[PDB]
Amino acid sequence: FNLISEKCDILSILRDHPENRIYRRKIEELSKRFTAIRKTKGDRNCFYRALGYSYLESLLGKSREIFKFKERVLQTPNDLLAAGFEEHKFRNFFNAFYSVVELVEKDGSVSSLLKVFNDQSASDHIVQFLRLLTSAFIRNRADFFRHFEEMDIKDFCTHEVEPMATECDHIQITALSQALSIALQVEYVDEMDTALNHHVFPEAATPSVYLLYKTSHYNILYA
Numbered sequence: 001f002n003l004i005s006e007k008c009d010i011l012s013i014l015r016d017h018p019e020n021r022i023y024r025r026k027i028e029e030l031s032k033r034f035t036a037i038r039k040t041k042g043d044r045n046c047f048y049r050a051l052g053y054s055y056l057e058s059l060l061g062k063s064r065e066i067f068k069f070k071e072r073v074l075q076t077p078n079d080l081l082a083a084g085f086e087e088h089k090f091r092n093f094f095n096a097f098y099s100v101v102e103l104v105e106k107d108g109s110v111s112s113l114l115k116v117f118n119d120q121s122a123s124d125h126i127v128q129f130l131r132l133l134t135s136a137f138i139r140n141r142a143d144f145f146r147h148f149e150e151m152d153i154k155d156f157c158t159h160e161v162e163p164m165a166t167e168c169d170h171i172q173i174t175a176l177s178q179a180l181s182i183a184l185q186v187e188y189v190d191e192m193d194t195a196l197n198h199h200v201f202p203e204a205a206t207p208s209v210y211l212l213y214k215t216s217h218y219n220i221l222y223a
């Protein structure tokens with residue numbers, strides 16, 4: 001479980017910042033609203049890896065939701081092709097993502113899903129697919145995403161989205177949420193003496209997924 005941990009009690013992360021009063025206060029507050037946490041490896045891929053695992057876990061046993069999601073994933077090669085990615089170059093990454101969606105449908109266990117996300121090869125193929133889809137979605141809707149002036153959208157996607165180990169910001173989160181119709185909530189724990197606070201992507205929605213963002217790193221929360 002080197003990439004995505006077993007579920008732990010929320011207060012188990014107090015030990016990561018001992019005697020730091022603001023982190024202690026915010027984790028204590030968070031523990032009133034969430035019961036458990038899964039840790040992710042900090043390798044610059046943790047947003048994509050956490051979102052991928054948590055969203056697919058939330059689908060286990062939900063036959064209609066799985067069927068609708070599989071219908072969208074089957075269309076995603078057209079998004080990639082429209083943005084100028086070539087099929088022979090994304091095929092191996094698309095096939096890895098489609099395989100793990102079929103595992104959710106046909107196998108349906110937390111233990112099998114956790115095994116795929118902790119297999120370095122399968123998990124990294126999944127992350128790379130999600131990065132190319134994020135890039136395609138931004139490229140194909142450049143008029144909308146210019147808002148997140150001096151930098152080309154194309155150059156942003158080439159440098160800060162497509163390469164493995166490049167960190168996320170609001171733009172990548174909004175884009176992948178829109179590209180796969182995944183509603184998620186991010187809880188922010190920074191070192192300032194401020195209120196524990198969150199954002200929902202998109203604004204109106206009931207979240208499937210809760211993430212904790214802290215020391216530029218994304219972990220999974222359970223309500």
Ligand SMILES: *CC(=O)NC(=O)OCc1ccccc1
Nearest residue numbers: 042043044045046047216217
């Ligand atoms: C999302 C992810 O994988 N994050 C990560 O690796 O963050 C580690 C880190 C901590 C402090 C500064 C830079 C990076």
